[PDB]
Structures are given as structure tokens and as C-alpha cells.
Design an enzyme around this catalytic site. Structure first.
Site, mmCIF file in Angstrom:
data_model
loop_
_atom_site.group_PDB
_atom_site.id
_atom_site.type_symbol
_atom_site.label_atom_id
_atom_site.label_comp_id
_atom_site.label_asym_id
_atom_site.label_seq_id
_atom_site.Cartn_x
_atom_site.Cartn_y
_atom_site.Cartn_z
ATOM 1 N N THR A 137 0.843 -1.183 0.000
ATOM 2 C CA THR A 137 0.000 0.000 0.000
ATOM 3 C C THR A 137 0.886 1.243 0.000
ATOM 4 O O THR A 137 2.026 1.197 0.463
ATOM 5 C CB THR A 137 -0.929 0.017 1.229
ATOM 6 N N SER A 138 0.360 2.338 -0.541
ATOM 7 C CA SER A 138 1.084 3.604 -0.626
ATOM 8 C C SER A 138 1.824 3.908 0.677
ATOM 9 O O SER A 138 1.239 3.842 1.758
ATOM 10 C CB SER A 138 0.104 4.738 -0.943
ATOM 11 N N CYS A 187 11.366 -2.540 5.288
ATOM 12 C CA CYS A 187 11.185 -3.761 6.054
ATOM 13 C C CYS A 187 12.273 -4.774 5.679
ATOM 14 O O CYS A 187 12.838 -4.727 4.580
ATOM 15 C CB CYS A 187 9.784 -4.328 5.786
ATOM 16 N N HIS A 243 9.605 -0.308 0.321
ATOM 17 C CA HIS A 243 9.222 -1.550 0.966
ATOM 18 C C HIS A 243 10.461 -2.423 0.802
ATOM 19 O O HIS A 243 11.322 -2.127 -0.029
ATOM 20 C CB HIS A 243 8.028 -2.194 0.247
ATOM 21 N N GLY A 244 10.559 -3.481 1.596
ATOM 22 C CA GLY A 244 11.702 -4.366 1.490
ATOM 23 C C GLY A 244 11.498 -5.692 2.195
ATOM 24 O O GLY A 244 10.482 -5.907 2.866
#
Lengths: 141, 95, 4
Positions: A29-30, A130, A88-89
Site C-alpha cells: 500500500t502507498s 522492512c 518496501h523491502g
């Protein structure tokens, strides 16, 4: 001898990759609030005299191309190099807007033997992302 | 006469291996908020590892997640400093 | 608060 030489003509570059919107396939998500981080970092490093370059919503291919190009620049007159990744990750992985890319692929471009103008100079990678899905419940003190 | 090709890298991770990293929609991520605050307050004096250590403390003590979803509520976070640096780093220069 |  004990401290890195930081009196070159330039402190160096501060590359900020700010990924906020992702392809639905990623299920991400954004990343609301990331623009605040990007602006904060820009000002913070500006005050440290770094040449800041902000890039928004880059695909995994664009991230690799950007890093490759930056590593091919002549950093001779720069004391250091900074790269900030906001996205993100997963463990060892950073996300382009369209998918994952290994962090190792990104950092390898700057290896002591692949980016000669940065050899012996501090190369900093600041990663807000993450590294898995475990949560820390903490302990009361 | 030679140095490792992996030397002189510093990876300032926002969180520990395998864990979530938190971001507030209004104020930004806990890690970046803290990093910028500590840099602004101490970059004219402290060595980078010591600034990052204060970032670790700030994130660890001043933040806790709040969520209507109990699964994501009351969670904590600790950043992860990974250094292959061979010298001390100061963002200031005594001339 | 959201998770990366």
C-alpha cells in the site's frame, strides 16, 4: 589516520530514492509519510553540505540504472558517498515500484574495485525498509 | 598496499534482520525522523557511530506503534548499524 | 503507523 579525510572540495553526493506508489502485484500500500522523510533528509544533508539528488517512484530497473550511472561518475573531488533508500523491502532486498531487487546488486557498483574514485572513502547506505515480517513486542522497563 | 573491496561501507538499517520497520503517515518513519534529528543536533560534534547509537536509543525508547488492529499494536523497533568502516567519520572539518 |  584514525579519521576519514573529509576536506576534499565536496562532501559528496546524497542520493535519495523515495518510493511511495507501487504496482498492485507487490501488494504494498502507498507509503504515506515517505515524502516527509524525503524532505527531512534533503534539508538535513543539505546542511551537511552534500549534493542532494532526490528521485521518486523508481522501478527496480531504474534504481539499478541510477546506481550504475552514479558509480560511474568521477568522485575524485568528493569525500564520501551517501545513498538513502525509502521503500518496501525484505531481508537483503529493496523494492522498486514494480518489484524486488537485491541490495547487494545496488551496493556492488560501489565496491572498492568497481568505483575507484571512492576507494578508501566512506560509502553510506541508509535503508528505511522492512527486512521481513517479524514484529518486536518489546519488554517493559 | 591493498584493502578489502568490501571495506569502507556503512549500512544504517532502520530495523533488525527479519523485522518490520515502522512509518507514520503523518510524521514519517521512526528511523528517518530520529536520524535527521540526531544529525541536526550532533553532526557538528559527534562521530557517526555515536550519532547512530543515539538514533538507536531514540527509536527504541520514544516510539511504539498504535493500531486498531491488535496484531500491529504496541510494537517496538530497534535499528541495525552495520559497519565495515575502517576509520572514524565526522561531518565536520577542523581546518 | 504502517509497516514497510
Amino acid at each position: 589516520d584514525n579519521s576519514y579525510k573529509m576536506d576534499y572540495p565536496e562532501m559528496g553526493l546524497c542520493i535519495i530514492i523515495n518510493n511511495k506508489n507501487f504496482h498492485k502485484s507487490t501488494g504494498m500500500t502507498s507509503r504515506s509519510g515517505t515524502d516527509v522523510d524525503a524532505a527531512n533528509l534533503r534539508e538535513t544533508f543539505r546542511n551537511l553540505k552534500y549534493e542532494v539528488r532526490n528521485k521518486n517512484d523508481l522501478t527496480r530497473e531504474e534504481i539499478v540504472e541510477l546506481m550504475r550511472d552514479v558509480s560511474k561518475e568521477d568522485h575524485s573531488k568528493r569525500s564520501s558517498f551517501v545513498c538513502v533508500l525509502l521503500s518496501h523491502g525484505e531481508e537483503g532486498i529493496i523494492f522498486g515500484t514494480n518489484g524486488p531487487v537485491d541490495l547487494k546488486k545496488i551496493t556492488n557498483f560501489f565496491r572498492g574495485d568497481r568505483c575507484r574514485s571512492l576507494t578508501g572513502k566512506p560509502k553510506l547506505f541508509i535503508i528505511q525498509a522492512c527486512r521481513g515480517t517479524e514484529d518486536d513486542c518489546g519488554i517493559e522497563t | 598496499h591493498k584493502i578489502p573491496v568490501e571495506a569502507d561501507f556503512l549500512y544504517a538499517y532502520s530495523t533488525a534482520p527479519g523485522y518490520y520497520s515502522w512509518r507514520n503517515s503523518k510524521d514519517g518513519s521512526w528511523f528517518i525522523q530520529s536520524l535527521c534529528a540526531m544529525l541536526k543536533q550532533y553532526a557538528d560534534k559527534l562521530e557517526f557511530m555515536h550519532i547512530l547509537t543515539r538514533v538507536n536509543r531514540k527509536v527504541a525508547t520514544e516510539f511504539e506503534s498504535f493500531s486498531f488492529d491488535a496484531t500491529f499494536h504496541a510494537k517496538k523497533q530497534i535499528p541495525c548499524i552495520v559497519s565495515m568502516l575502517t576509520k572514524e567519520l565526522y561531518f565536520y572539518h577542523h581546518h | 503507523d504502517e509497516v514497510x
